[PDB]
Ligand binder design. Structure first.
Ligand SMILES: Nc1nc2c(ncn2[C@@H]2O[C@H](COP(=O)(O)OP(=O)(O)O)[C@@H](O)[C@H]2O)c(=O)[nH]1
Ligand SMILES: Nc1nc2c(ncn2[C@@H]2O[C@H](COP(=O)(O)OP(=O)(O)O)[C@@H](O)[C@H]2O)c(=O)[nH]1
Ligand SMILES: [Mg+2]
Lengths: 348, 101
């Protein structure tokens, strides 16, 4: 478990914040939010929790993500979690967090596969995290089931648009490997909000459920459908694994063996896996934080220039200074005589 | 393929399933959530009452270990008037292996 690529980026945020906080101003470290987009049963929830590094989300077959979950990571001296609707309560075990998520979902949506556009806000504190916003959205569908109205498609789409048309947001498009990539819904959305692929990152899931004799080699090599940032293959847990409480360590080891042994993927074994997706995202934050430094320097540079002309004199102040008093006297008298002539004569 | 490939293919479907004296076979794999099928959405829009539509489930040997399609084959998840029929075809390895029908 855990995400150790944050450690190299936490102090940079602290140092810059301490730099501005001393002057009574805050640092515009507007780190982007990460939205996970995909279709029903694509694997989005499994992907997202691997970036957080904690096992707390609900996952499995069926419509499990019935409400948008917004996770806010906050740097803190101790690790704990809390909800907005459980004010005054403290969560010290993520299993309780997962159960609360299901309970809060059913209380509003019912049990017959309902949805609700009102999100759930989870705030996890920890010393090993940045101040990040992570969004876990419901998957998209075509036809209603259970109590879903005829317009279930568009209600889900609007929930999606509110979080992906927002600037400064990484779109993490997850698609299954055992379905034709031309018929993925994630990529249809990405190419409508991010035409040039500057934000979009593709993930290919379910590489271990391919039909025998077929592979995704022309996908992971960015040949079938060119994507600016390429595709990353991942092998998450199976539904049996979820119900079997399979450990994370075993899942990662199996993912490593898979890519190292599959004949069509060995030459890409180092571009794929859970840890590589962490590295790409972390590197994506680091590029953003370092791309904003020029603005911060210019702000401080402008302020010094404005203040410098006066503090040059204040720093040399001595109360016993006849020269200052007489210089002040000549300035006041010259100001009065100019103001006086202005009002009477019209000069100036 | 131009940007409007989606609506060019759809306009071809709407020339054969938008008329009477026609049966429609809604084909969809079983290794994906049935709620996301494009076959049913088209059939439901053209044949709301399910008079003509018949559902087919094509890939039952490719389902993730630990689940099954009973909720569909028993016409419970998305009840369809004429039910659903499950089939198991030749894999890609078999097509290239010259396996007899
Ligand atoms: N074996 C395997 N199972 C997967 C993979 N990706 C997703 N699944 C399964 O697909 C189901 C759906 O997972 P989930 O992410 O909750 O779908 P979601 O509704 O999009 O969140 C789960 O049972 C996962 O175990 C994969 O790469 N390999
Ligand atoms: N293993 C397996 N493969 C299947 C099954 N049904 C279809 N396929 C595969 O589906 C692939 C494409 O089928 P096809 O009918 O051409 O899809 P189409 O583009 O709609 O015609 C073929 O390679 C088949 O081997 C199945 O039940 N099991
Ligand atoms: Mg989900």
């Amino acid at each position: 478990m855990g995400n150790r690529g944050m450690e190299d980026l936490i102090p940079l945020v602290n140092r810059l914040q301490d730099a501005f906080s001393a002057i009574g101003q805050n640092a515009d470290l507007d780190l982007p939010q990460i939205a996970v987009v995909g279709g029903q049963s694509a694997g989005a929830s499994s992907v997202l929790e691997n970036f957080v590094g904690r096992d707390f989300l609900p996952r499995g077959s069926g419509i499990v993500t019935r409400r948008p979950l917004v996770l806010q990571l906050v740097n803190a001296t101790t690790e704990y979690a809390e909800f907005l609707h459980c004010k005054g309560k403290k969560f010290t075990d993520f299993e309780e967090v997962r159960l609360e998520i299901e309970a809060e979902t059913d209380r509003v949506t019912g049990t017959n596969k309902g949805i609700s556009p009102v999100p759930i806000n989870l705030r996890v504190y920890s010393p090993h995290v940045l101040n990040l916003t992570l969004v876990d959205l419901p998957g998209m569908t075509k036809v209603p089931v259970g109590d879903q109205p005829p317009d279930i498609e568009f209600q889900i789409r609007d929930m999606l648009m509110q979080f992906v048309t927002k600037e400064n947001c990484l779109i993490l498009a997850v698609s299954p490997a055992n379905s034709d990539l031309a018929n993925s819904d994630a990529l249809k959305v990405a190419k409508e909000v991010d035409p040039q692929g500057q934000r979009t990152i593709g993930v290919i899931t379910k590489l271990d459920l391919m039909d025998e004799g077929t592979d995704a080699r022309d996908v992971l090599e960015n040949k079938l459908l060119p994507l600016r940032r390429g595709y990353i293959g991942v092998v998450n847990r199976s539904q049996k694994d979820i119900d079997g409480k399979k450990d994370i360590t075993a899942a990662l080891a199996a993912e490593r063996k898979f890519f190292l042994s599959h004949p069509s993927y060995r030459h890409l074994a180092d571009r794929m896996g859970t840890p590589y997706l962490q590295k790409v995202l972390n590197q994506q934050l680091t590029n953003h934080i370092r791309d904003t430094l020029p603005g911060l320097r210019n702000k401080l540079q402008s302020q010094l220039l404005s203040i410098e002309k006066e503090v040059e004199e204040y720093k040399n102040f001595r109360p016993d200074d006849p020269a200052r008093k007489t210089k002040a006297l000549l300035q006041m008298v010259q100001q009065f005589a100019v103001d006086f002539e202005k009002r009477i004569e019209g000069s100036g």
